[PDB]
Amino acid sequence: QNKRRYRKDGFDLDLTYVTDHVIAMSFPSSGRQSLFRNPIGEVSRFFKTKHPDKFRIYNLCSERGYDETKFDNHVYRVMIDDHNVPTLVDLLKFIDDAKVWMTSDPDHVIAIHSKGGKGRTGTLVSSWLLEDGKFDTAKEALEYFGSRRTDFEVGDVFQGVETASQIRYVGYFEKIKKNYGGQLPPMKKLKVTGVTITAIQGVGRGNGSDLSMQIVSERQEVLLCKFAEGYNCALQYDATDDCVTCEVKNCPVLAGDIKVRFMSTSKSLPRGYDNCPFYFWFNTSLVEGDHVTLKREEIDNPHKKKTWKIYRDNFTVKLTFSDAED
Numbered sequence: 333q334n335k336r337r338y339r340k341d342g343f344d345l346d347l348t349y350v351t352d353h354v355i356a357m358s359f360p361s362s363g364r365q366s367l368f369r370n371p372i373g374e375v376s377r378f379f380k381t382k383h384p385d386k387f388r389i390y391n392l393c394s395e396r397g398y399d400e401t402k403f404d405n406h407v408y409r410v411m412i413d414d415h416n417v418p419t420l421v422d423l424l425k426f427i428d429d430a431k432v433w434m435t436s437d438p439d440h441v442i443a444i445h446s447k448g449g450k451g452r453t454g455t456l457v458s459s460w461l462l463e464d465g466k467f468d469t470a471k472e473a474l475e476y477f478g479s480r481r482t483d484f485e486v487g488d489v490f491q492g493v494e495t496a497s498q499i500r501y502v503g504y505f506e507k508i509k510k511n512y513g514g515q516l517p518p519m520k521k522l523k524v525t526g527v528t529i530t531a532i533q534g535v536g537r538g539n540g541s542d543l544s545m546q547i548v549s550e551r552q553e554v555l556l557c558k559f560a561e562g563y564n565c566a567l568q569y570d571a572t573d574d575c576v577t578c579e580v581k582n583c584p585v586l587a588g589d590i591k592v593r594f595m596s597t598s599k600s601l602p603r604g605y606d607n608c609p610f611y612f613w614f615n616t617s618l619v620e621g622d623h624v625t626l627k628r629e630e631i632d633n634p635h636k637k638k639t640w641k642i643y644r645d646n647f648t649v650k651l652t653f654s655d656a657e658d
């Protein structure tokens with residue numbers, strides 16, 4: 333536990349001033365005893381004391397709310413699942429709400445929290461810093477969040493954003509602010525027609541036979557493919573090229589933020605986050621051309637270096653699309 337804490341004026345909280353007006357913190361907890369969980373009573377007292385009538389709180393946990401009247405009802409909820417991302421629609425809704433609040437008084441602060449004030453919190457903090465003009469790139473904004481939230485004098489565990497889709501989504505915000513005036517790009521609708529996984533050896537059965545793919549849109553399954561069986565698909569394994577190629581059938585029209593989960597019947601293939609071997613998010617409107625290809629570092633779960641004997645340096649997943657217009 334080397335997150336940068338606030339220990340002044342009779343407070344001891346897991347609370348970081350990323351800037352003078354932008355706070356990152358963990359969940360305001362109740363009935364806790366206690367150590368490194370912030371008691372809601374103390375957090376409430378902190379804001380009422382140090383920023384009277386000049387704070388707004390952002391709760392990023394889809395999983396849990398709390399008594400917002402402890403914060404005089406100045407709480408805004410962004411529903412994001414642990415280890416996942418907001419929809420771009422929700423991210424921009426958040427950005428505008430923070431703008432409305434921050435534009436009204438130079439002394440106003442925002443406090444962004446989640447469960448651990450790490451992944452989800454960093455995603456929105458880094459996006460806000462881009463909006464506010466402090467940084468011109470997602471990489472730098474993310475780097476800065478990491479350096480503020482991590483106290484390296486306490487320990488060497490990084491406390492910034494690490495999961496690949498969260499990094500991609502801050503990247504998406506950069507692209508939006510640089511190319512689309514801060515608003516969503518033109519709607520692009522797509523169908524997945526193919527999936528290709530390179531360096532398949534050592535991953536489950538190492539030939540795709542154990543794998544399945546679920547496409548999720550707006551928190552609902554919209555397609556399931558089971559490879560070996562030919563369930564909504566046709567599998568082809570190439571031993572010499574160390575890759576599997578699967579034709580994807582019956583994919584409905586996809587729009588917006590799409591989560592793709594890969595599941596396995598292999599006991600050998602460990603599960604990371606999201607109760608599966610690997611997954612990723614993308615946005616249909618930010619797809620360029622007829623495909624999206626993701627390297628190991630860009631996929632959720634293979635991003636962790638402990639998996640790097642399983643997912644080797646050339647492990648990639650490519651989705652092929654047809655334009656829902658041709």
Ligand SMILES: O=P(O)(O)O[C@@H]1[C@H](O)[C@H](O)[C@@H](OP(=O)(O)O)[C@H](OP(=O)(O)O)[C@H]1O
Pocket residue numbers: 362363395447
């Ligand atoms: O009822 P309380 O006192 O709030 O206890 C917490 C509650 O059960 C949460 O659902 C859980 O988080 P998750 O849902 O994310 O597991 C967390 O466990 P954890 O801290 O071990 O995750 C507990 O501390």
Ligand SMILES: O=P(O)(O)O[C@@H]1[C@H](O)[C@H](O)[C@@H](OP(=O)(O)O)[C@H](OP(=O)(O)O)[C@H]1O
Pocket residue numbers: 414415445446447448449450451452453454492493494495
């Ligand atoms: O609530 P947030 O701000 O999203 O923060 C996440 C939360 O603290 C998770 O419990 C943690 O996973 P573990 O507890 O399993 O470490 C995750 O680590 P991650 O960044 O490695 O996903 C954090 O990002």
